[PDB]
Amino acid sequence: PEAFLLFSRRADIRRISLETNNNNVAIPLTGVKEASALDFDVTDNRIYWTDISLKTISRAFMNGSALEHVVEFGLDYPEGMAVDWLGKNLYWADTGTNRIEVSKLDGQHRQVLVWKDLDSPRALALDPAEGFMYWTEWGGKPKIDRAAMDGSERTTLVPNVGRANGLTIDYAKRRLYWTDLDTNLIESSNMLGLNREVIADDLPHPFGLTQYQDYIYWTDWSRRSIERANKTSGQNRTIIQGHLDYVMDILVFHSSRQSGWNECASSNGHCSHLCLAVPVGGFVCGCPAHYSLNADNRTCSAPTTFLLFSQKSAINRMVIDEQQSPDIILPIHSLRNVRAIDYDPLDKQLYWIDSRQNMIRKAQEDGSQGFTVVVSEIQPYDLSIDIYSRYIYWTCEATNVINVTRLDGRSVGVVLKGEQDRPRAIVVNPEKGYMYFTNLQERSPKIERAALDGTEREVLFFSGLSKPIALALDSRLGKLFWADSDLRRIESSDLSGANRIVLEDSNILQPVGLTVFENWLYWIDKQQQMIEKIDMTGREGRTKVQARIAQLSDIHAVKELNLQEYRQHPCAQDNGGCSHICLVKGDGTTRCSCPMHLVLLQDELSCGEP
Amino acid sequence: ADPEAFLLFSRRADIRRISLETNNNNVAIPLTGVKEASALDFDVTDNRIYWTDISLKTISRAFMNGSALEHVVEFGLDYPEGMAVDWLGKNLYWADTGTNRIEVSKLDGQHRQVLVWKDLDSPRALALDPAEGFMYWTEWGGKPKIDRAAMDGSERTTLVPNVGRANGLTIDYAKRRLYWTDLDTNLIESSNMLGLNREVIADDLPHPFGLTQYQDYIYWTDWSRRSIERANKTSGQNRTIIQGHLDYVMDILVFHSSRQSGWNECASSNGHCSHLCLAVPVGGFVCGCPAHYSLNADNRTCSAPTTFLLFSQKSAINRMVIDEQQSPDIILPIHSLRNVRAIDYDPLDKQLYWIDSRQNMIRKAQEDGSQGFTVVVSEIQPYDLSIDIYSRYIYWTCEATNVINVTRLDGRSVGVVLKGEQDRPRAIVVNPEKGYMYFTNLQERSPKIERAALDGTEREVLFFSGLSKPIALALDSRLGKLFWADSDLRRIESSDLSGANRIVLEDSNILQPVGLTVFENWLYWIDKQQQMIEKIDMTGREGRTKVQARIAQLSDIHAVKELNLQEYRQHPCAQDNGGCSHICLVKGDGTTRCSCPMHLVLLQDELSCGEP
Amino acid sequence: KGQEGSVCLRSSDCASGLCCARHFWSKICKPVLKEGQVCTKHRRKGSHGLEIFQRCYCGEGLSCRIQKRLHTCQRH
């Protein structure tokens, strides 16, 4: 076919013919605001680009059809990208987020390959045939690193260099070309970062860079152009195009740029998710973020135990791998203002309250299968799931009640509504047929307990309370936890209400969320913008988990569900044959109960009108 | 005033005006010869704009109608990045990141003075508050900050220490606050006039640069979005774009009468100050003087410096005083200067003489730069000069014809007094008090230092050994001492005028001495390569001392002491030139003979010179 | 060789403790940064091309890291 040159400038991507250099035409694209990094896929006849304003990574055919965003979450400054034409994978480097990530060309199965010891990765260049990838870093002390295309064997290829850009690979001649923005020159070396040579140092302001056949192409910020030169000599120079300012990325589009073979190219390595190239031109199977590679070295299994912390416009998942795996933003669309969150370990579904819409919603990890469970005046404050009976307890800030609703939106009814009292924080403990909640009464706040049917009420604590805003509990530890906003402290006691102690009153500003994961107590501080944890074993003391997390709203721990043990709950299957409420005391006693507007009937299963 | 408030901004080759309206007309001020305009201010009462040009290295002004284009400061500038107008005292303030100085002068440029020179690390933006007597500026060093001081340079202190490169420093006078951009954190901040109550007005900005405010809005520029935008000055919201597609907008400002209000004692009869009227927070105002001038006992008038030191470079002649305060040296505004090789000074008429090595002439001018006059022109190639202030003569050496030539101060020749086949006179110093002259004679492969009578007779060799490059001479008539510097031998030596008692003064840590001068009891000298001015105590009581470092292309240095007019007239040649036609020599007994150049002969009058 | 403020073209034209950084629309010799001194950190790649007030890099054994928002030259 033919070989044209691609370049990005502001809100459009264009192509200049290399035979007829004056043929400057645009690529039929829409919606682009600030095109930065640029790549392609000759096979699929597709173009790829990142948008640092729109915070996306998009793709489309050269004819402009099938424009689609492939990555639209957790991006800050995606100034590095590269298409893996063999493994059919998409690589990118974010400077704002300090991560080198990977996924499929269509965006699924995203995973972080590099995140530890990363300072401003800018340019990225792949080599699937050899199983290596290279990138420049600007932060701290500029350098060019290398690593297997799975993130392994990371090493500093070039230690002494200025901020480098336009990292390009001469696949045929096996060399690395780049521009040094600080030293102001074009350099070159071998794959080992040796045999280093300066191609040109008398250029006014080189920025972009690429190479094709015997030539190198660069852009000049000051001469406002795209020029060309003998790739080894640096001479025999001509001007391809002039009057081109603010050119971000430049790249030659031709078949001879994406050649070679890979095991990932044959059958994706028989991998269930990601096929990632490694040294020798071999490969390895990779998984999505937080997923684990099974013993068969080819299949992936999702995380079973993890933490969920929410902020105003995002819900995040974090895990505790020794690998130190970084937290991620769940791809859930239309998040306006989340107040609280919970999770269903049985069907792996995420639930949350949205104060903007005054409703309760739910969706899966991957953000699909969305569904609203409660809509409306109604004004949800906090929620807590009974994973056994299969319904959601939640408190309303407007009507001041505790409403119960099936996971399918089907209403059950009200279980607690008394004048003067105001339910706020709530956690259910179905294992013992109880529920704990804070009661922010007009003049006296207290922490209460009751049966899941709203009966058998009793005040656990009434002193040392001005604004109990968060609750948590752990059966194993036999503890009840709460945090007070006004008193700036976290307290604990036994589920019984005995042995009350202050866990921490120092260095606390605004606690809004508590949860128990493993044997630690995690809490979020909305004002300090932190997530901290204390060891309930008293061996590790107090440490910080994350810093600078804006608009923290809630934090929730998820433990793997023991199905063999879950099924043993009498109120689990068919809801114990109960019409509405099914609960089980600690003395084994199980029984059907009813919401306030109904009554238990003669069959002691069904509920009817009084 | 009634005229609407409009927006002015500098933009490299031109300065333009726009309205507060979005997408409204954008017109360039009809100016000429503007290369790179940066700092920008105005004087509404005079209908004038001032701007700095970092390519021309000047500060200029003109009316809004482009007329009256004049340069107000055109010397001693490197990067005048900051500049502000004191509309009350009618003064011009500016800061220079290259020279590290905050200076002030009258709006027309005269009576320039340095206000801050110590502990300065790249002063950038400058905002004045003549009503309160305070000035504020941003500083861009290793540790950027925003400092404050009295508008006389007194009471300097850091107002906000925890900041990056701040720019567009502007004051909201009505509501007592400071606004600025930050080029390192890309945000627009604000604080009260004390650097406290520090709030962030806008943070989601890609590349903010310029800034200004008027009424309830702030206006800024953005290099990335190529724009001029505005927003709520307290909120930071209600944002709109005023202008788009504007490349490289350097400085911006609001041209309205309400911006330049208030009053002080300086606005009225200039505080009765002879030269400068400088507002201060405590005491209303203080009177100031030009660089190196003293404020007289009356607290109102000034007196020029009496004694000082002159050191020349290749392209400039500088003056520096010897103060306990360590007052900064200044560049003399001589337009005639191009390539100086040697300097001298006539204390009688108070005028500065130098040799231009390229145009090959000896020129003259007062420190003011005015009254310039060429006294020697052409082949002729002047090497060094030494003024006889009594007979009003210049003794100079020619590198071309290898002679010692003597010329009157007005331009007409007296004649040659020394010429020889193998003679090559270079450095020269006259001692008309005793009747002799001293010079270096760079004969081929045997350099030497000689003496002779001011007519060329009684020649003798003082020194012929221990020399390689006798490059500079200096003498002290009072103590009958001679000093010379040798470039090759890297040392400064001394001796009696007779040539006895030859002693090495300094021969360590010297590379390239090229100038000597005696100032009181000290011997000052300049090292071309070390780029330093140093001094030793001739009495040896105190130790070798550095005066100034990092001075490039040093050529000559010269001490000027106040002339004793009475002691001056005691000299037998002071008036009527001793009754002689040409040279007036001084006998050992204070009596005077008359002599002549090489081409004339003394007549029977024993006063006149005729031809054989 | 080039001193601070001197016009330069390449860092090689400058003295030992200096580099060739652009100031406005030409380049002059500027000093390298020392420990504690504020250093440049670009957000967008393009902001590097637009910079007309360029600082020098951090000196030997110094790294441009964030304070514990400015960045200062700190030791590894």
Ligand SMILES: *[C@@H]1O[C@H](CO[C@@H]2O[C@@H](C)[C@@H](O)[C@@H](O)[C@@H]2O)[C@@H](O[C@@H]2O[C@H](CO)[C@@H](O)[C@H](O)[C@H]2NC(C)=O)[C@H](O)[C@H]1NC(C)=O
């Ligand atoms: C835009 O192009 C796509 C894909 O590229 C086309 O086919 C390539 C092999 C190559 O020849 C390119 O020049 C072409 O542009 C087109 O996708 C095709 O769509 C048709 C149905 O419309 C389908 O039958 C084909 O299988 C598709 N091709 C492939 C390779 O899958 C698409 O039609 C073009 N869009 C428009 C609006 O014309």
Ligand SMILES: *[C@@H]1O[C@H](CO[C@@H]2O[C@@H](C)[C@@H](O)[C@@H](O)[C@@H]2O)[C@@H](O[C@@H]2O[C@H](CO)[C@@H](O)[C@H](O)[C@H]2NC(C)=O)[C@H](O)[C@H]1NC(C)=O
């Ligand atoms: C350009 O303007 C100057 C000065 O501005 C004038 O006075 C200001 C206070 C203000 O009122 C402006 O609108 C005026 O234009 C003009 O200089 C003046 O000229 C007049 C008439 O010749 C003379 O009487 C004044 O003394 C001058 N100076 C001042 C300070 O008023 C000048 O004429 C204008 N040039 C052109 C070409 O129009």
Ligand SMILES: *[C@@H]1O[C@H](CO)[C@@H](O[C@@H]2O[C@H](CO)[C@@H](O)[C@H](O)[C@H]2NC(C)=O)[C@H](O)[C@H]1NC(C)=O
């Ligand atoms: C508890 O939740 C249920 C729904 O989950 C609410 O029931 C709704 O009541 C309104 C009347 O106010 C009806 O119009 C809706 O059709 C009902 N929804 C469903 C799904 O039945 C109920 O209002 C909530 N709280 C209270 C106080 O009952």
Ligand SMILES: *[C@@H]1O[C@H](CO)[C@@H](O[C@@H]2O[C@H](CO)[C@@H](O)[C@H](O)[C@H]2NC(C)=O)[C@H](O)[C@H]1NC(C)=O
């Ligand atoms: C010495 O100085 C005088 C000027 O001070 C020079 O005299 C000039 O001589 C030329 C002839 O060569 C005349 O045409 C000029 O008119 C003279 N100038 C003046 C102002 O008188 C003289 O050339 C210098 N050198 C010598 C060797 O005499």
Ligand SMILES: *[C@@H]1O[C@H](CO)[C@@H](O)[C@H](O)[C@H]1NC(C)=O
């Ligand atoms: C490129 O440079 C090399 C070395 O100077 C030279 O041998 C070769 O001919 C050049 N190639 C072209 C296509 O000009």
Ligand SMILES: *[C@@H]1O[C@H](CO)[C@@H](O)[C@H](O)[C@H]1NC(C)=O
């Ligand atoms: C490129 O330039 C070199 C040096 O001027 C010359 O020798 C060579 O022949 C040129 N090559 C081409 C292909 O023009």
Ligand SMILES: *[C@@H]1O[C@H](CO)[C@@H](O)[C@H](O)[C@H]1NC(C)=O
């Ligand atoms: C999985 O990888 C490990 C590590 O190389 C290897 O020891 C093991 O044999 C592999 N398992 C299978 C089923 O191939």
Ligand SMILES: *[C@@H]1O[C@H](CO)[C@@H](O)[C@H](O)[C@H]1NC(C)=O
């Ligand atoms: C700016 O904000 C303040 C309060 O934040 C508000 O009172 C004012 O109306 C806003 N805008 C204007 C035009 O004053």
Ligand SMILES: *[C@@H]1O[C@H](CO)[C@@H](O)[C@H](O)[C@H]1NC(C)=O
């Ligand atoms: C500015 O925006 C606020 C809301 O963001 C609005 O209430 C106000 O009316 C706007 N303008 C003024 C002049 O206050």
Ligand SMILES: *[C@@H]1O[C@H](CO)[C@@H](O)[C@H](O)[C@H]1NC(C)=O
């Ligand atoms: C000059 O200033 C001093 C100190 O303020 C003062 O004592 C003296 O009276 C002043 N001389 C005048 C005003 O003539």
